[PDB]
Amino acid sequence: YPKTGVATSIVEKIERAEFNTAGRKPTVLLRIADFIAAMNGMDAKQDMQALWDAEIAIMNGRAQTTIISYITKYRNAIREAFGDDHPMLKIATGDAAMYDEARRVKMEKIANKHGALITFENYRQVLKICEDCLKSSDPLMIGIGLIGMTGRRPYEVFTQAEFSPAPYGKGVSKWSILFNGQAKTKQGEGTKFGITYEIPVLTRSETVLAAYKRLRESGQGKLWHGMSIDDFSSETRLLLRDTVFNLFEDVWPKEELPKPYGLRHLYAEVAYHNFAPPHVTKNSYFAAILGHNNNDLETSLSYMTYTLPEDRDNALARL
């Protein structure tokens, strides 16, 4: 197995950081680069274990959550420099107890949400705003609108989504499009990786598609296209965050602040409300439209966040 290599992306990041004139020092990326370098020429498992142990020692005061993320960064770096068969991958791991606890925390949060759904009282207004965004000349605005209307993830919409018209007999679907470019997935059976699949839309599909090509043909849309996730975050995350804060500050439910992924939650809640066939559970429908693996009903649980006021009324009406 390779006893030498470099994590190219990390060092490119550091080298780009060499010319900043503002901002935090890239301490973490640095530690990761040093780590990978020190690893060069290492052959003994106890040496590897020692090195990792020092790294884990440094991460001490961080949040459990932060530590899991960081561990992912180191593991991806090792994997990039030395490949998949490097014994350090058996060693640079988190404790099972830590992963287990993260899971417990998460499921508890979700359970808490399921017993106290937030009533999205002004959701029609939110969707209206998103429809209006589809006509803006600012491609960020169009992007947001497309989030609301298609429920695609921001990274998907801005960097890789392929929206297409969807058939319906001999005609074209008014309320559904074809989508390719599912993120957070990898090649496999039952996976939507590189799969084109049909998704409902919350305004006319023509409108959506037109707004999309306008996004893709713009200047900023040309930068965005095919970008990596790190690049995407750096270029757009804070601006998108702020714009969304502002756009929905008045209409969003009081229980939470307006965030981009909010739109993906609402979308699922709205599409189910409007389009769900009768022989299918809410879990199944959500998993279907959100691009989840074939037999995964559990990720859908994360998205049951809101109650639409019509349903709140109707349920209250008994008795």
- Residues found near DNA in the complex (CB under 7 A): 13, 16-17, 20-30, 62-66, 68-69, 71-72, 75-76, 89, 93-94, 96, 99-100, 102-106, 109, 153-156, 183-185, 229, 232-234, 237-238, 240-241, 257, 259-262, 265, 290, 299, 302-303
How far from 204 is each of 201, 207, 208, 211, 237, CA to CA, in Å? 7, 5, 7, 11, 28
Find the length of the chain: 319
Positive or negative: CA dihedral 277, 171, 208, 130 = negative
| DSSP letter assigned to residue 21 | S
Residue 96 makes contact with a second copy by CB under 8 A: no
State which residue, 110 or 210, has the beta carbon closest to a second copy: 110
Q: Should residue 114 be labelled a site residue for a second copy when binding is judged by CB under 8 A?
A: yes
- Residue 111 beta carbon to a second copy: minimum distance, rounded to whole angstroms: 4
Q: Which is nearer to a second copy, 22 or 317 (CB)?
A: 317
Query: Which entry of a second copy, DNA, none binds 220, CB below 5 to 8 A by partner kind?
Result: none
Dihedral sign, Cα of residue 120, residue 247, residue 240, residue 193: positive
The yes or no reply on residue 116 touching a second copy (CB under 8 A) is: yes
Q: Which stretch binds a second copy (CB under 8 A): 55-63, 105-113, 124-132, 237-245?
A: 105-113
Structure tokens at 250: 């008045």
CB nearer to DNA: give 9 or 173: 9
Least Å distance, CB 172 to DNA, is: 28
**Plot region of 190 (φ>0 → left; ψ -120 to 50 → alpha; else → beta):** left
Q: Across 28-168, where does the E strand assignment appear? A: 118-119, 162-168
Q: Quick one: DSSP state of residue 280?
A: S
295 binds, among a second copy, DNA, none (CB under 5 to 8 A by kind): a second copy
Residue type, 155: Y
Minimum CB separation of residue 317 from a second copy in Å reads: 10
311 makes contact, choosing from a second copy, DNA, none, with CB < 5 to 8 Å by partner type, with: a second copy
Nearer to a second copy, 97 or 315 (CB): 315
As given in the structure block, the two tokens for residue 97 are 């107890």
Q: Which stretch, 40-48, 191-199, 245-253, 289-297, contacts a second copy (CB under 8 A)?
A: 289-297
**Cβ proximity of 51 and 12 under 8 Å:** no
Q: Say if CB 110 and CB 71 are below 8 A apart.
A: no
